[PDB]
């Protein structure tokens, strides 16, 4: 019933044993509310190694 959306489960991995690289940018906030309607924001990403 509560209009709240927050991170609750970090169900991604079990062990991070021998790490080498970490990248952390400055803290900020993003909207986790369940926005409805037609898709307004368009995000285009390109990855290459």
């Amino acid at each position: 019933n509560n209009k709240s959306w927050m991170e609750s489960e970090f169900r991604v991995y079990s062990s991070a044993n021998n790490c080498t690289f970490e990248y952390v940018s400055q803290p900020f906030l993003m909207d986790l509310e369940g926005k409805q309607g037609n898709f307004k924001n368009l995000r285009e990403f390109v990855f290459k190694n």
Binding site: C19, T20, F21, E22, Y23
Partner: protein, 49 residues
């Protein structure tokens, strides 16, 4: 550091995504001995690791 580990369980800490300013390290005369076995001590500022 306030307390160092001992030789039986020598602590190992990682260095990443930094600029390793060896100038202050080498110029600090508080150290007793300083011996590099692989490369010339003065040139660590040039060859990137």
């Amino acid at each position: 550091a306030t307390k160092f580990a001992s030789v039986y369980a020598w602590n190992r800490k990682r260095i990443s995504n930094c600029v390793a300013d060896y100038s202050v390290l080498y110029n600090s005369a508080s150290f007793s001995t300083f011996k590099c076995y692989g490369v010339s001590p003065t040139k660590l500022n040039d060859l990137c690791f």
